[PDB]
Ligand binder design. Structure first.
Ligand SMILES: Nc1nc(Cl)cc(-c2nn(C(F)F)cc2Cc2ccccc2OCCN2CCOC[C@H]2CO)n1
Length: 468
């Protein structure tokens, strides 16, 4: 009897799983929201921002109206190479953004030391990809890497149709500290990463006024063989493709149809993405330069606050945020947490939600969210930035691991605004001027210098309908 080769296993459940980390795909947890779990691992934050020069440019007329198509292509070309490196070195990519991706190696505590060595080697090989590389002629693409190690809590929150996840805690705050001081071509170790690592492997230098450390060199001992060392490390790596599946980048590529699993996983993914996955919309339809309004919501908590207090508060906030976004036709594109703040990157416009008064409505949605979230137990401060303009939208990443992502100066501006103008709703000139609203609904603000933004134009506070 013939034995034909198995065909390409390209099921919906596999396609959905490309949009999610192993943390979620193989997580099997309770239906309760919030859900929290606790573990240890190593985090790697790869800063891919070295391409502001790109996204702006691609809206230029020289791109003959194929700006978004070209941008997705060149971006995924570079990011795909980063993603293969992470996956091959046994990491789990948690999330992508316009400025970054974040990857996890989850391990038992005893193995933290050895996995840090794996992750440092990975980092150095990532820098290696970009040593003589440039987006065009004479404009250089390099990355910056922050690494951390230690305790990690995971939070899953959401409702009956939508789910969202975050990591929080020691290693997350640490990787933020590490990435904030990393420069081009750096690999920075958090203080705890430096405390836990194998100091005989690496030579570091101190970073002035900092307990975080920079890697100069990975100098292994005489008898060290990385491939043998890596193989021993894989003993502790639950889902590393192996045996008959060692030719695959992810075990998730082997997922078989399972309606209960797919029902759970699809809740993390946008309906417009599911449509493409089900071959009910063209595969290139979501790559676009689109005029949108970004509403970037920051929920701050006190230093005292741990996961078990944060979780219910984010859940309560979320339940209100989603109800407002549903009304005013908005989407949560991303959720992030760093600097004691859980942020929601919300978007008005873009896939099929393109309704007029996008601007008045974005402002009122923002105020509604601000007023409600301010009353949530344990939420110390709410801050919301609102910016409107042309942004890149697209599925970013590798074939086997990618996410729908929004990229552009308006995204970055909204993010700085909520950070540098805490406790209020702020908006940019486009939103202000384009709103069908009287001037006294606003307050014109002092110009601040915001790290990673140049010439923001006049910024305003959305005061609201009344003096109060
Ligand atoms: N807390 C948390 N949990 C998960 Cl599962 C993912 C993230 C996360 N992913 N990504 C990105 F790479 F896609 C970013 C984050 C937030 C984050 C966590 C630790 C350290 C830094 C960090 O984000 C850096 C700031 N960057 C700039 C300002 O806007 C928010 C953020 C996302 O682009 N954060």
């Amino acid at each position: 009897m013939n034995t034909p080769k198995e065909e390409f296993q390209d099921w919906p459940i596999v396609r959905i799983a490309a949009h999610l980390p192993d943390l979620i795909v193989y997580g099997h947890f309770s239906p309760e929201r919030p859900f929290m779990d606790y573990f240890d691992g190593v985090l790697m934050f790869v800063d891919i921002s070295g391409f502001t020069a790109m996204t702006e440019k691609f809206s230029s007329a020289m791109y003959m109206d194929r700006g978004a198509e070209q941008l997705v292509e060149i971006l995924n070309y570079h990011i795909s190479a980063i993603v293969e490196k992470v996956l091959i070195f046994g990491g789990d990519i948690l999330k992508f953004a316009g400025d970054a991706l974040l990857a996890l190696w989850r391990v038992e505590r005893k193995q933290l030391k050895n996995i840090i060595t794996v992750v440092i080697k990975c980092s150095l090989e990532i820098h290696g990809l970009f040593e003589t590389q440039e987006w065009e002629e004479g404009l250089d693409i390099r990355v910056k890497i922050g690494l951390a190690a230690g305790h990690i809590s995971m939070l899953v929150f959401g409702d009956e149709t939508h789910s969202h996840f975050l990591v929080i805690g020691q290693a997350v705050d640490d990787v933020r500290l590490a990435q904030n001081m990393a420069q081009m071509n750096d690999v920075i170790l958090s203080p705890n990463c430096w405390q836990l690592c194998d100091r005989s492997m690496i030579e570091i230098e101190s970073v002035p006024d900092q307990r975080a450390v920079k890697v100069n060199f990975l100098k292994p001992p005489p008898n060290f063989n990385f491939d043998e060392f890596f193989t021993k490390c894989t003993t502790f790596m639950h889902y590393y493709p192996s045996g008959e599946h060692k030719n695959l980048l992810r075990l998730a590529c082997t997922l078989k149809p399972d309606p209960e699993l797919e029902m759970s996983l699809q809740k993390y993914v946008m309906e417009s993405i599911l449509k493409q996955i089900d071959n009910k919309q063209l595969q290139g339809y979501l790559s676009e330069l689109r005029p949108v309004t970004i509403v970037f919501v920051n929920l701050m908590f006190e230093d005292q606050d741990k996961a078990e207090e944060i979780g219910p508060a984010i859940q309560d906030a979320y339940m209100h945020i989603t109800s407002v976004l549903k009304i005013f036709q908005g989407q949560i594109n991303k959720v992030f947490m760093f600097d004691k703040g859980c942020s929601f990157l919300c978007v008005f416009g873009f896939p099929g939600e393109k309704v007029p008064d996008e601007l008045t409505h974005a402002l009122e949605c923002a105020m509604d969210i601000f007023d409600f979230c301010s009353q949530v137990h344990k939420i110390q401060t709410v801050s919301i930035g609102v910016a409107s303009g042309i942004v890149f939208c697209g599925i970013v990443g590798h074939t086997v691991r990618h996410e729908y992502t929004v990229i552009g100066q308006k995204v970055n501006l909204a993010a700085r605004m909520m950070m540098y103008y805490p406790g209020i709703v702020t908006c940019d000139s486009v939103t202000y001027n384009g709103s069908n609203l009287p001037a006294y609904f606003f307050k014109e603000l002092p110009k601040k210098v915001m790290k990673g933004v140049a010439d923001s134009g006049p910024l305003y506070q959305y005061w609201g309908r009344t003096e109060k």
